[PDB]
Design a protein around this nucleic acid. Sequence first.
RNA 1: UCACCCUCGA
Lengths: 34, 228, 217, 49, 62, 570, 712, 75
Amino acid sequence: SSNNSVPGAPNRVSFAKLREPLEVPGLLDVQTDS
Amino acid sequence: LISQRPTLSEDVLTDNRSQFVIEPLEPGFGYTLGNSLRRTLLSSIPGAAVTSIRIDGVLHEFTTVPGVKEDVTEIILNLKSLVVSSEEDEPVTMYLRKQGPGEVTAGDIVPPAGVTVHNPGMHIATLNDKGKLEVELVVERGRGYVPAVEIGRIPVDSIYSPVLKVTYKVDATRVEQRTDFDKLILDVETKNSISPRDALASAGKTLVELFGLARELNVEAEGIEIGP
Amino acid sequence: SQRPTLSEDVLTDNRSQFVIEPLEPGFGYTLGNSLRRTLLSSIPGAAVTSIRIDGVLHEFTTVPGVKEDVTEIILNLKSLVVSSEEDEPVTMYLRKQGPGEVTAGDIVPPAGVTVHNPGMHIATLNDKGKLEVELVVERGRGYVPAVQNRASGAEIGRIPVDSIYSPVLKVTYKVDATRRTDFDKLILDVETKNSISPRDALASAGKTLVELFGLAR
Amino acid sequence: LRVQGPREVQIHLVREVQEVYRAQGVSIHDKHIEVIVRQMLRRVTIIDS
Amino acid sequence: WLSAASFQETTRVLTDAAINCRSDKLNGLKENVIIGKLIPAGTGINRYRNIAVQPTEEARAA
Amino acid sequence: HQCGLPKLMALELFKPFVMKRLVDLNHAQNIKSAKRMVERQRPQVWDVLEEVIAEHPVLLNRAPTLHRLGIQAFEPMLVEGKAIQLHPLVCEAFNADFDGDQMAVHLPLSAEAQAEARILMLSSNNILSPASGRPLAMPRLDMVTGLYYLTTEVPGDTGEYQPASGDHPETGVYSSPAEAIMAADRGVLSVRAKIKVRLTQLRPPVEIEAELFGHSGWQPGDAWMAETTLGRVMFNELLPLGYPFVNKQMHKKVQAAIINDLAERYPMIVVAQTVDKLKDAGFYWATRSGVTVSMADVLVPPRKKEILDHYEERADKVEKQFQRGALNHDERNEALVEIWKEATDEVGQALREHYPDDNPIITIVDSGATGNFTQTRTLAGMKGLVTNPKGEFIPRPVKSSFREGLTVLEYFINTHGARKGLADTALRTADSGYLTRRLVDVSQDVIVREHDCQTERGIVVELADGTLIRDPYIETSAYARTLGTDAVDEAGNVIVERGQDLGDPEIDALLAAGITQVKVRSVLTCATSTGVCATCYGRSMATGKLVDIGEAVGIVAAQSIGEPGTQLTM
Amino acid sequence: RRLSALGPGGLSRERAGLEVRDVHPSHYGRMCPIETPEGPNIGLIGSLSVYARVNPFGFIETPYRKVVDGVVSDEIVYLTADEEDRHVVAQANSPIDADGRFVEPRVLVRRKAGEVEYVPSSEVDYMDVSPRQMVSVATAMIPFLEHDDANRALMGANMQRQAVPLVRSEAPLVGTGMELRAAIDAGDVVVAEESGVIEEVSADYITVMHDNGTRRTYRMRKFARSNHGTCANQCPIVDAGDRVEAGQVIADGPCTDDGEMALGKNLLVAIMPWEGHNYEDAIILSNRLVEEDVLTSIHIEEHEIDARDTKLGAEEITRDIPNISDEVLADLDERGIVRIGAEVRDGDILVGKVTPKGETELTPEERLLRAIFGEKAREVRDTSLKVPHGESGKVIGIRVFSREDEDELPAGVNELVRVYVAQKRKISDGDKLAGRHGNKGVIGKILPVEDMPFLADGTPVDIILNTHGVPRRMNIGQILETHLGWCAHSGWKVDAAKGVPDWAARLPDELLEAQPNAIVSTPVFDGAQEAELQGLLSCTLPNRDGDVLVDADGKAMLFDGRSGEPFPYPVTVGYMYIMKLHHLVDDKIHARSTGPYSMITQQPLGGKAQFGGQRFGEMECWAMQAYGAAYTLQELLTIKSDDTVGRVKVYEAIVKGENIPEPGIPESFKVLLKELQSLCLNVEVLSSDGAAIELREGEDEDLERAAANLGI
Amino acid sequence: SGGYDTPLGITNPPIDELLDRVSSKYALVIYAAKRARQINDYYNYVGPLVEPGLQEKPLSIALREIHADLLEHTE
RNA sequence: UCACCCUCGA
Ligand SMILES: [Mg+2]
Ligand SMILES: [Zn+2]
């Protein structure tokens, strides 16, 4: 709903019926880790 | 600002039908006056026509009239096509009575004072041997088209409009700098009451009054022209 | 069959309903649309032709200290509603130093022209922000995209802008049909920017349509 | 070809090809496949020159 | 040999055509396409290509 | 016959022409200043350009060029913008859409090239597919939808003719179609309402004409009564003057047959103008048709849950039977595939049974404008079973329609078949193209040389308990041939004589007389030394008449075979 | 994040079969099955999934939830493809006891074989961490993805990343949760590295003061050209004195709006065929989108030219250009370089450059001048850089490197100057628009705001999408997007007096009421269900006049803006997200009457950049032959392409208004003959009955007319 | 040729009537082409035999001549 | 301009 893990992010109310137990990792980690 | 040279020309197909071209118009105004001119030509021109008819001997069974081959439906169809001009505001009745085997024409009708039948050579019905036809007609003025509105008298569909069929189209004819200007083509087919020229002129006068209604509102600045 | 009449109702300063009646059956829609198309298209007004900022020679750069770039400033300047009695090219000016917000009220219009929304945001300045803008205002109709410097005799500093001349905001209509005696009652609904009042715009379009339909005769 | 003659192998090839094309609902007039098949039988081999 | 060389397996075609010392008659369509000659089909046929056009004497008077 | 040509493209393409005509007029003193004037784009050029373009055709091409209709000549009209404007009827020929396609323009220069463009390659000259003879350039999908809505009949619509009851007259008859138009301007007469009109300028059907008139003659202005809809009247107005009145709901098949007859009998230019008028009216009434999509217009089958419960009960029986080792693994998968095929078909049947005939989805599918009902079944009903990467069916189907939305698993399973097909088509088009190239090579030497082989050889086609059973191949094999031996039957007469066109009337009259087989000339048995003869090849598909002499029918045959190659699947 | 199967050490391109490209069952949660090229690279390039990470060994692992005793814990275990097949994995969509357990008897699961089946809840080892686990970034941004087929979903995912940035970015009214995260991880947005308060904000930079007391400043990328020409501007979204936490977005990038990915605009769409201008996938636009710069985009292009050392001497970048008017040079500075801010047109000089002429090609009439007037010092020619065809804009910037100064330049290159030119492209006919659901199209016509069908209150629709394109293509997510977009535009208030209606009871938490123009998200496979959208369609808030313009069917009554009569049936209208893809007529239009040729085969060059001609290929010649048009085929193949003496003859004849001459011989045929002779093949062109024919021409044919033009 | 709407530009004159004066379409091509370049030779050799338009392309004049049978031909 | 390779468009 709030997606408050990111500060100042606009409030986009979510129709989601399921909780997210894990958060999206660093989308660039495939490069930076390497 | 100012926009000029909107000329109007006419191509004559027949005496009762013509095409008009208004060109050239700005990229607007091609469809603003396109549908309005047609609807004005159709509904806003005054003209007289038949409203109701009564024929003896056919009262209770409207299916057939003895002595003539045509049904009552075909009689009403032929009668609705009659063009007539009446000067009397109140309804005026005419009569058509013809006996003996033969063919009845619109000239065989006796027009009361003030009304005029414009197509005498029109066909109505054919009388069998020892046949006779007596029919009352009701003629009055009106506008546009209206469906069927003393027992033994039936209402018909009244075609008051002196114009029969109007269709319009818009095409581009602008300068090479623009190549987008509209141009109006109007195909108009009218009855013998008036030529398409006079029908277009009456529509123009009525619409000039209509819009003029608005102009009176402020009587202010608007797009100028050169030729009228 | 009585002569048609035109009455006016008022909702706000810039919005007015109009009622025309009687009209032939099925005729109201066509009249409402013939007027509406004319209102949006060809109501004359005044707008900014080209601007000029001192420290910038072209549109794609940033004046120091100001928060918005020159393109964002131009798009904010697009919201300006202005009126002009000159019908000739004129020049407004704006000189402002931060730290403060620049608005449309901070522009100094010359004689004859008027800015109708001083509360509009233009740009935001800080301690180091300094904004000096010329705004050429002209009078026209419709929508004219920016006049390029090759067409006019403009110089490099000139920043032509798209000018939206139409004072009208939104036009609609609805008809009441009545069926022995059938007739249509047309209801126009005009809303304009504060440049002009709906009566003025409707009268302008009425004169335009009278001049055009005069060709039929 | 060798058993029933050249006039019959053309019919065989035309109807087989047109049948595969008709399996997918394709309208190809036979004269085209005939133009193609006609080219296939224009030479003769030589046993004893 | 030109058509066959342009179609497929150019190296083998050219080898065999060099051995047999072949001479292309330049007859088929694709050959005229290659050498830029008017193709022998449609408007390029000698029947249509060499048509003579002259106004009739009756119209030549007018 | 027209194409929209951007101003910049036309100015650059005609640059020497506009320079020459711009030196003719004194805009430029010499030719170098004329070139500089066309390069600076000074306004004087544009008025000159419109002159140099007049009646100078151009060639439009879209790659890949599958048949000769992939290149067509047009008369260029100067158009504002930088995009090429293409006539909507020539799409099917080019297989051209407007999802981002591009086309190329070539300007013929020599007099002979311009003549070939105006005569051979003109857009309005090629209306028929040279492969099948059918006519492309027929109203495609949107246009049809409009026609389908314009001529369809609505029982109980506004203005519907009703018989006289008591003192109430009929009120369903109109003296002329103009009166019907005036009644339609008011809310009185619906366009789709069944009425009676007196038609003065239209020819009636053969039956009404033969009863009311003589067979030989009907004339303009001769009135006759018809019970139709005003829409069908306005449609028949689009058709040429002499064509009889149709009075049918216009499916794409029916208007296809109409254009077939018009091309078979009437000249070409009439057919072109007729399909143009059909285009205009179809687009107008497609705008007015009120065809739209919404989540409500997509109707889920009402008993779908119960159907799926029953068929999965069957499948659970099959799996329990497999758990005892009775059923074979491959037999198990085959049984499940059969079960869920049947479930898919049942759900689709229920869907069609629940869908009213006026729904926009059903109207779109069944009017023949676009789509097939299997897309309606996957959309609203059910997806069914999906392909394996190996190609097999997966024993579990996708029970969710795309309206309900697939689950994660169903979507992932669908991706298999989706990408499998996307990849397969890339190789299939290459195979078709290579085969087409080989056909072109082997067949390009085949052109018509002389008029008649004169040989009496040919081939036998069927065309057919004592009742007529029609042969499905008549169009592909029997039709369009030339008769080598005139048709003879028991108690025979002159029915079709040797060398006749063998068109539709000839085929019909042959079949009616009791003919069951015919022997016609063909290219197979043609006796020409080099090439083929016109009479043995038959009529040209694109022209309809006998094939000309210069025609290179080998390339036409190669293209005709290889064009629908990418449609052949396993 | 792409994964490519081609390259050194992997399989070659000719080794790529259909079976390596297909979606493998082990790609679940590792490689996205939707996002992949449409062309020859299909199945060879694939995007990494969202939750997947690369093993130290080089494997791809995907997270799962450990299920102990039928309960689902928060313990996440990453599994490779090897470890996964030993276990049976549940699905992300699963019924769960408040404590955590499966309420359904048998759930659907991915088998070790990967085949789907049914199994009880005590045998489930792991469960998906989330839906979209299998989906990439670009694909997970498609709302109602589960309502689209993999073909159109693929096209939508691939078309999102083809969208240009717009002068201002408008976040989508209806989206997913991926816009924010994808934007901030993409790297084109400015983020606060440490919590603090903004000390200063300018268009040039943003300086923040941490609670540490340490300053940190971020410079704004302003009108920087990207690799593909799309402009990448950066704008601050914070004001002076705002307190920002670490990780907050300080300034937006090109396609970001307040931190979220905004690849297009929210447009008012009507779904109906309109007079055939939207026929066959075309698109009708409201002229507003021009006047209000809604789809306007900035396109920067870089021009480069260098003066170097030739055999005759060194080139010079100078304003001194021989035989050139002062008027055309007016926009150039003393250096010969164009001046910043000037507007450039096709053929305008960007950089003046002269090159020493060898005098071997010097004109006889010019050698008259050089010999009579004694020209000694400067013999040069105009090699100056000009603007390419169809390209125009405002010179933004100029950078220059000189050998006279200390700069690294390649050998022989004296000076090197780059001129940047930006153009503001409005939306126009031919430009390519597309939604997130694979619905593409070009703009057939942009009608004036009056011609556009308008709602009851006079609001004209912005874009008219043809109806026939929706049902067959199996992308109905666009329709649900339209419905929810109207619901988000007008806002809604679900009635809750004895409320909690059974449809709104399941998902909506505080989605009960929403103010107009709210932003909502439909996560893929967890988006709003159909019942909830149908419910929202009813409680749509009215407009300012109290009218409900869109009924509970999502449709509305529209008025034909041309005639004025209302359209007879209600049409679906709503708000759809439309992107301007990077394919524009200004880029794609090309025309060539005559131009440069390749020196080897003498055929016209190719490509718009090289001012090349269109290739009339083999199949096009097949078509031309099938027509039997011989002269057209010869003209295309001889005097238009390869006839060296016929090209200039044709141009001269048309210039002087004469007939077109007879074609000659294609020069590439001479090249073929020479190539065969180089292969030890003796090729000879024979006469009718004669021997080999000489194929070349004598040089004395050209002298008569030259000596005559000089007045012999 | 009965009733039909008047042709516009290129399609004038209609090809059905022009093909009535020639055996094949290709022969008509060569016909009009040779007549057209003959007319163009006249401007720099006989004709035109009909009234030329405002600015008429020579091929169009040639076609309008072939329509009126104002010239003969031989294959 | 020549040759590769890459990523795209129908
Ligand atoms: Mg396409
Ligand atoms: Zn033969």
